[PDB]
Amino acid sequence: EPARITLTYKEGAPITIMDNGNIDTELLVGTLTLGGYKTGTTSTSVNFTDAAGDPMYLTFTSQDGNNHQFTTKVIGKDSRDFDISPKVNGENLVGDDVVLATGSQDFFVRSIGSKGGKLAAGKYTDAVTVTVSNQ
Amino acid sequence: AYTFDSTMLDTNSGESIDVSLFNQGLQLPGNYFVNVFVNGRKVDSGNIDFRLEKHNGKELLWPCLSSLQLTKYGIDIDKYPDLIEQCVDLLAIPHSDVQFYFNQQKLSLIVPPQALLPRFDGIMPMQLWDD
């Protein structure tokens, strides 16, 4: 039995900086679809990590040399529409450990906001590893 | 045309991972576990050291093979004294090809039938045209 893992990423609506220089909270930054995995794959077995390593959050940084940053969370729903989440940098933000949905599972990358200070308009990046520890 | 950089490579804290060979569509020189084929007949599996060498303008990975190993693969090393550090000059065999098919980890040696040891019998013909 092979171990197939796939991920699709779908960008959300365009993001704009508010009058106060922050971005809004709870914006749908993008949608993740994890797939290929054997039925029985669990949410604690999935870990999204990045270089910033902030437990529970992914961190995006401006590419203009001025180091503007914002954070985001990754959360989803189980079959009973309860809040669940994969590990992000080693820790779950919300919910109980659950069996992922059969075939594939969606997660949503939601905005939290700037890390400190006004955000400048421009390109913001992150490089995210998606580790799945198969049963 | 694709280009890689080191952004997502596990770097041993200020170590530096060079991806310049991968960007040309080459692989790293070093030790690879391969199946060895001589004229399409599988003969071995072993760790073999490869280095980059330029052949008619093209860089390719090139196997360090011993005379002892060639014998073991079906080749009459005595025909080719120019074969004889412990790596043979494979270009010493005329009418021959050496290819590392990387994706398969397959080292393929093609060699004039006269270069080979006979093998009676018997999926193969009684005699062969040569060169």
């Binding site: 197939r4 796939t6 029985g40 998606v130 198969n134 | 994706n103």
Partner: protein, 212 residues
């Protein structure tokens, strides 16, 4: 839905666990680039805590794999002293690295899948396979958690677990040891299970009352 820009990633390993006979010269496992673009494959081995140790060697540890192509990894024991009375667990992780791609905030995120599978070091002293001892798990409830007990010398890699008809997310039970499962919600207040066999398939269902 093409309103929104999309990106796709995927790495496949040819098997879902490796049974490594203690002192074997080495074992082979395939890796496949299921995508439409080349990747670098970076493979590494971790101890059971997911930490760096190098009692095992993977070659090649970094190589380029072209769109839709497959290659094999050789996993080879490099000494180390292992216990003879039970299996040891490591992890092989195979990561696929993608090539480079006044008011508005442009978001550019790239992903890499790191597909990890169990590497089970099995002393030749151990007779049998895990399916022969799967029925021997016993179960108790202590401090609000459901505790599995595994008397066998094999990791019991649970692949399906239910407690009073309600699903529990699987985890291995270590050899000659226990694992404690958290009991959420409405699961509190009989256990049924299937292990994953050495070929990665779900084995038969067993069911037992809790004890204590």
């Amino acid at each position: 839905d093409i309103k929104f820009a999309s990106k796709e990633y995927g790495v496949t390993i040819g098997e879902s666990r490796i049974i490594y006979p203690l002192d074997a010269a080495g074992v082979m496992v395939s890796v496949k680039n299921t995508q439409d673009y080349p990747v670098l494959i970076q493979s590494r081995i971790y101890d059971e805590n997911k930490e760096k140790e190098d009692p095992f060697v993977v070659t090649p540890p970094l190589f380029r794999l072209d769109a839709k192509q497959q290659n094999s990894l050789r996993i080879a024991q490099a000494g180390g002293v292992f216990p003879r009375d039970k299996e040891s667990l490591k992890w092989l992780c195979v990561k696929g690295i993608p090539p480079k791609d006044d008011k508005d905030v442009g978001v550019f995120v790239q992903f890499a899948i790191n597909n990890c599978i169990k590497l089970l070091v099995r002393p030749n002293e151990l007779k049998g396979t895990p399916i022969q001892f799967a029925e021997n798990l016993s179960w108790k409830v202590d401090g609000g958690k459901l505790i599995a007990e595994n008397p066998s010398p094999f990791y019991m890699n649970i692949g399906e677990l239910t407690f009073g008809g309600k699903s529990i997310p699987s985890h291995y039970i270590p050899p000659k040891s226990t694992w404690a499962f958290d009991l959420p919600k409405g699961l509190a207040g009989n256990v049924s299970w299937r292990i994953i066999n050495d070929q990665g398939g779900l084995d038969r269902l067993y069911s037992k009352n809790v004890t204590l």
